[PDB]
From Swiss-Prot, chain C:
It is an enzyme of class 5 (isomerase). The chain holds residues 10 to 182 of 328 of the full protein. Completely inhibited by 10 uM of nickel, copper, cadmium and mercury ions. Inhibited by zinc with an IC(50) of 1-3 uM. Metal ion inhibition may be a mechanism to control activity in vivo. It catalyses: D-arabinose 5-phosphate = D-ribulose 5-phosphate. Optimum pH is 8.4. Keywords: Carbohydrate metabolism, CBS domain, Isomerase, Lipopolysaccharide biosynthesis, Metal-binding, Repeat, Zinc. It comes from Escherichia coli (strain K12). This is Arabinose 5-phosphate isomerase KdsD. Substrate binds at residues 66-67, 73, 79, 105-114, 139-141. Changing residue 143 to A: Shows 19% of residual activity compared to the wild-type. It is able to support growth. The lineage of its organism: Bacteria, Pseudomonadati, Pseudomonadota, Gammaproteobacteria, Enterobacterales.
Length: 174, 173, 173, 173
């Protein structure tokens, strides 16, 4: 009644957000699938919190699909200062905020390794979407959480977006 | 070709979600009630992909007013679930519903009197049977050519979890 | 001969640090054992980078020893505003630095929540060292790494110091 | 009593580390060499306690100049090791030396022509046998009364790791 009622609203809200995501699978999508396709190293995906947990499942998906990739936590990379990433790698930074500090701090280091940077953000005017060689936008219009305490639609949009990159590359390799 | 393949996946999944609204049935309510009265911690656990999602799930619960944490089934094998107590609530995530790791903890999880909630894709799975409440997330179509990696299923578990989080949040205020 | 030589020097450097640790198993150690012993909730362990991975194995050991406890990344709790930790929990913040921003950022919250705070650092004059209810020191004199690029002696001391809490608590029962 | 039990655990472990020196032998040199010429990534993996340490190990390798990262054996199963290429070097951590998960990755790993290094406490183990270079970390005495949680073996692996990181670092400029 009340509970089931509350659940379906969230579901409806996220299914509507996914229908809007259709437009964002555009040139940037293709463009990013190319940077990864020609990668002789590893696709390094990294993010914070919810994003981090998604970016994680994202890395496992790439790997089991023929795109070598691994997840790394921004905070952990800071110390070793991305000693796990080389010029041969391609980095995917995930953030809905687009203003995260951890990842933002790595920008200067990542930048001066001449490693391709792909950023998945919910705002094209963010400093990640900014500094990235290629920006993949996952902007959503409506959040399924009333107080916005936790990400819902944005989180799910990123997950699906990643699956579109995984399978896309898989097909590109015939 | 790329964008073509990318949208196909997006479509397939959006189609599977539309099928999910049915599973938000009485069980959903039932599960929300078991968790709503938990005085301990909502313990979420899973394997591989499920594990990754199950992690985001726990994080979402926490920031939502439902205290919870994630634990890997294998890790708790040695400790025999030393992190789980009677006043806790367990949410086992498993699409196969026949995961060995989790299956093993089942017995131990029962003689601890901990309300077990299972999120599976098979209503006739070992976990579905042994659980006090089973939350179904079955999907009819895979978005990956060789199912090398779960797609429609994993996203169905993610949104489902988001639906439990906010539901409970609204039940409070 | 040149590699074995190097490997053996590290082993020796860390062993000499463990001998300096005996002193630190003092009144604070027992003081922390008690705070954990009467905990009715969970022993929430949290750390960053190297400390985190150890704090991770630390929680697993506690749990498998009879001390209910889990790991949680400091930055992750930043979002949930520490929604996974309640007043009847006990927090163990690991940091050799003792000035880590993330952990420092949570202090105010932990404080304003009435949660027993135990800190494991390598400097008795750090923020969390002094901001904790019980500081467990793991200071080391010599670093096994030439450029200090990665923590070596301090990291291994924290692992042992933790193993020293799990077994002690265990025996206490 | 508490401090009494905390110091004994410390002694027992310090004793085991004193037994480790011997193992920092030829195999150590081999391991260091194959990792030194690695053009890809040093991929560390393990289960439970081993896993948490193998993690700090990867972090330590990286921050030291040895590009590396951790991956859970189970997770790698589904992707048939999609993370690893022929250009990589694998470090499998397992005290038991008979872990089912890691054993399964062996055939695949060999069929990739990737250099396999194993860190075990059992020279006669399956992964000790099937490895290109077995690095021994056997310990005579356990710090835990009921062996509910690894202690000496877990700590020996950690140090053995630190010894490869800095050893390789010094081998560089």
């Amino acid at each position: 009644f009340d509970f089931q009622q509350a659940g379906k609203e969230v579901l409806a809200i996220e299914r509507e957000c996914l229908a809007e995501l259709d437009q964002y699978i555009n040139q940037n999508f293709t463009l990013a699938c190319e940077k990864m396709f020609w990668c002789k190293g590893k696709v390094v995906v990294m993010g914070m919190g919810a994003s981090g947990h998604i970016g994680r499942k994202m890395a496992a998906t790439f790997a089991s699909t023929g795109t070598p990739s691994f997840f790394v936590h921004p905070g952990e990379a800071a110390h070793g200062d991305l000693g796990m990433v080389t010029p041969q790698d391609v980095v995917i930074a995930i953030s809905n905020s687009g203003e995260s500090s951890e990842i933002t701090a790595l920008i200067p280091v990542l930048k001066r390794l001449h490693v391709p940077l792909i950023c998945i953000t919910g705002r094209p005017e963010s400093s990640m979407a900014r500094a990235a060689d290629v920006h993949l936008c996952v902007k959503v219009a409506k959040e399924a959480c009333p107080l916005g305490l936790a990400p819902t639609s944005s989180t799910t949009a990123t997950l699906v977006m990643g699956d579109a990159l995984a399978v896309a590359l898989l097909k590109a390799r015939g």
